[PDB]
Amino acid sequence: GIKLKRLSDKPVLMPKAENEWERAAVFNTAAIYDNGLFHLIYRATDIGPHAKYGKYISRLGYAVSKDGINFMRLDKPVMSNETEQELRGLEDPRIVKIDGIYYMMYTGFGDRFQDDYRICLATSKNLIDWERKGVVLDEPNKDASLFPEKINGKYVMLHRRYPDIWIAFSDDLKNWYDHKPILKPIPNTWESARVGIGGPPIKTKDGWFLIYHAADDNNVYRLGAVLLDLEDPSKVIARQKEPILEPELGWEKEGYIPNVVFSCGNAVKDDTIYVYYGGADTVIGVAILEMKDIKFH
Amino acid sequence: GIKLKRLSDKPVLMPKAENEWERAAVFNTAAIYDNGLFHLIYRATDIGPHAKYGKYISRLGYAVSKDGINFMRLDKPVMSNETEQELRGLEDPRIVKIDGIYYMMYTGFGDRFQDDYRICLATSKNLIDWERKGVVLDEPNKDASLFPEKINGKYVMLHRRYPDIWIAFSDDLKNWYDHKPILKPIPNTWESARVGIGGPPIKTKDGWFLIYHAADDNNVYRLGAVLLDLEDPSKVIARQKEPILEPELGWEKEGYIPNVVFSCGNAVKDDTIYVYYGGADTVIGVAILEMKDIKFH
Numbered sequence: 001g002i003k004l005k006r007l008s009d010k011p012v013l014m015p016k017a018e019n020e021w022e023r024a025a026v027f028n029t030a031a032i033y034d035n036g037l038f039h040l041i042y043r044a045t046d047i048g049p050h051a052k053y054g055k056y057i058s059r060l061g062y063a064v065s066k067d068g069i070n071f072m073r074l075d076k077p078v079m080s081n082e083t084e085q086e087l088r089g090l091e092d093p094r095i096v097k098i099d100g101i102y103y104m105m106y107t108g109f110g111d112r113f114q115d116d117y118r119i120c121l122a123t124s125k126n127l128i129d130w131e132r133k134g135v136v137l138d139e140p141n142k143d144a145s146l147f148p149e150k151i152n153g154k155y156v157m158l159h160r161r162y163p164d165i166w167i168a169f170s171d172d173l174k175n176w177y178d179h180k181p182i183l184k185p186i187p188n189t190w191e192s193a194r195v196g197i198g199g200p201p202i203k204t205k206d207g208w209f210l211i212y213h214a215a216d217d218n219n220v221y222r223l224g225a226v227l228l229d230l231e232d233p234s235k236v237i238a239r240q241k242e243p244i245l246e247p248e249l250g251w252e253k254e255g256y257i258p259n260v261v262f263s264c265g266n267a268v269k270d271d272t273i274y275v276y277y278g279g280a281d282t283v284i285g286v287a288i289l290e291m292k293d294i295k296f297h
Numbered sequence: 298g299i300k301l302k303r304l305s306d307k308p309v310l311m312p313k314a315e316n317e318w319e320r321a322a323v324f325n326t327a328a329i330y331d332n333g334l335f336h337l338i339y340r341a342t343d344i345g346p347h348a349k350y351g352k353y354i355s356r357l358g359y360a361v362s363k364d365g366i367n368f369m370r371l372d373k374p375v376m377s378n379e380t381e382q383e384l385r386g387l388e389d390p391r392i393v394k395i396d397g398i399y400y401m402m403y404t405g406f407g408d409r410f411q412d413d414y415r416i417c418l419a420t421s422k423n424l425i426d427w428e429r430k431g432v433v434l435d436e437p438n439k440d441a442s443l444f445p446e447k448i449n450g451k452y453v454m455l456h457r458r459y460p461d462i463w464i465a466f467s468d469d470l471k472n473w474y475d476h477k478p479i480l481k482p483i484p485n486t487w488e489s490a491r492v493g494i495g496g497p498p499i500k501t502k503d504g505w506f507l508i509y510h511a512a513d514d515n516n517v518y519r520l521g522a523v524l525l526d527l528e529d530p531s532k533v534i535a536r537q538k539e540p541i542l543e544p545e546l547g548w549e550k551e552g553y554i555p556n557v558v559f560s561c562g563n564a565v566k567d568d569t570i571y572v573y574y575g576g577a578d579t580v581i582g583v584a585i586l587e588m589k590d591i592k593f594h
């Protein structure tokens with residue numbers, strides 16, 4: 001069934017040594033198609049994003065493209081480390097647009113104590129000027145996004161109480177209810193250690209199309225695909241057995257974190273899904289899936 | 298009466314050594330306030346912008362700001378030299394937005410023969426992806442802009458048949474009529490050698506507020522102010538005798554072209570006009586005028 005098709009044998013975005021904030025790595029980017037352009041809000045670090053290299057700080061950059069492959073980038077981050085919950089920065093943003101407002105969920109990494117990372121919310125009208133709304137769930141959690149529309153009058157979010165994907169609901173984004181797990185790892189497979197969402201889910205005639213990531217027992221990260229019921233997204237309609245994307249190219253296999261592909265963003269233009277993904281926690285690539293090719297056994 | 302008030306004793310944008318296309322000078326920028334942000338489309342050269350420095354090529358960059366002083370900038374130009382009319386590049390853009398479309402008029406400098414510079418038009422929905430519409434007037438001309446709305450069903454443009462400011466009208470942007478001069482130099486003053494528009498005119502209760510530039514007999518460029526009738530913009534209601542801005546700071550007086558302030562852009566936020574201007578054809582500054590302070594003798 002489903003396989004993502006790389007648009008290039010080269011990354012679409014790489015670190016820039018001359019800017020401290022994005023000197024070492026650019027990865028794990030949000031992506032959205034709006035007003036005739038592809039927009040990336042990308043994670044960037046000053047040093048290799050692993051504790052063995054030091055106290056890396058993650059910040060968020062902006063890039064834009066007409067074609068989804070060739071990007072122009074701003075010289076300064078659109079969000080920087082400002083709060084105590086963001087001592088070590090902002091990570092892995094997922095963006096949806098609802099009624100003219102962009103809702104970005106990101107991980108605020110504080111590292112002040114065990115499991116000091118939290119899902120946080122920021123909003124914008126223009127993808128440049130971001131207003132912090134605070135922590136969303138006060139618990140160790142990440143890999144979160146809103147659904148791109150309200151379902152039955154409610155905001156819906158995916159999250160990740162380790163090691164499973166969860167869903168929850170809210171009337172106002174301030175308090176959440178009906179938490180339940182929807183997707184778990186599967187033993188003795190490529191998806192055995194843990195799972196988490198990729199980018200935000202995409203609405204389809206047949207259901208919500210959701211890309212997810214998983215790690216195996218050697219911490220190799222790959223992407224997979226699930227389909228959720230439109231009206232009750234807690235119901236998994238289908239889940240592909242095999243991955244849709246695995247580390248294959250040199251810059252997916254080799255980098256600060258080896259053997260990783262990881263998505264936080266999937267932009268849609270004319271029934272084609274552009275999946276942006278970090279390679280080896282170092283660079284950003286892009287692969288596509290035409291909506292007509294979303295087919296589960 | 299009217300004096301522009303600098304927001305800073307430093308430029309808001311300067312050339313960038315790392316990027317050849319904007320290595321020498323950034324100046325003469327379009328400016329517009331849209332969707333909560335100030336946007337600049339700025340002229341940039343690889344080489345000092347005069348024949349004495351070399352065969353400079355002008356290209357157009359993008360910068361953005363929340364506050365109108367501190368800008369983030371894209372790493373590549375949004376328009377580059379692509380046609381024969383643009384052999385030496387694109388200069389001095391003026392932008393207005395009409396019914397969701399940005400209309401940029403710029404000078405295409407060909408330098409293939411005497412007076413080979415032409416007003417050209419490009420349009421965009423997003424300020425990044427520009428569509429060329431071609432030469433507007435096939436004659437030696439520059440310092441042109443649309444009015445930011447139609448007047449009595451017609452597009453209106455200002456232009457500059459040397460050395461005077463002219464106006465013309467069009468049904469469709471393809472053919473122009475009712476050309477007439479509206480503003481001339483005045484002998485034995487600061488505005489003796491020539492005049493031309495600054496940025497696009499701004500609509501006011503009392504008339505169209507239009508900033509203009511002029512050179513004196515030693516080629517010192519300064520800005521002035523005129524008010525035009527709302528319904529017939531060929532009628533000058535008032536013209537201030539004295540300049541509203543003159544080269545004063547070191548980066549206005551010294552640079553590739555000494556003693557120049559020159560505007561192609563005036564963004565409006567909450568009844569304040571932000572006038573962006575090239576200093577010495579080298580850097581970009583900003584000065585403001587509150588609409589309540591638009592008062593002519």
Ligand SMILES: OC[C@H]1O[C@H](O)[C@@H](O)[C@@H](O)[C@@H]1O
Nearest residue numbers: 049050058091107109117142
């Ligand atoms: O969220 C905190 C921390 O968690 C993991 O170790 C990785 O995803 C890192 O990139 C991240 O900085």
Ligand SMILES: OC[C@H]1O[C@H](O)[C@@H](O)[C@@H](O)[C@@H]1O
Nearest residue numbers: 346347388404405406414439
């Ligand atoms: O327009 C052609 C040429 O005309 C003048 O010399 C100046 O305004 C230059 O900056 C420009 O390149």
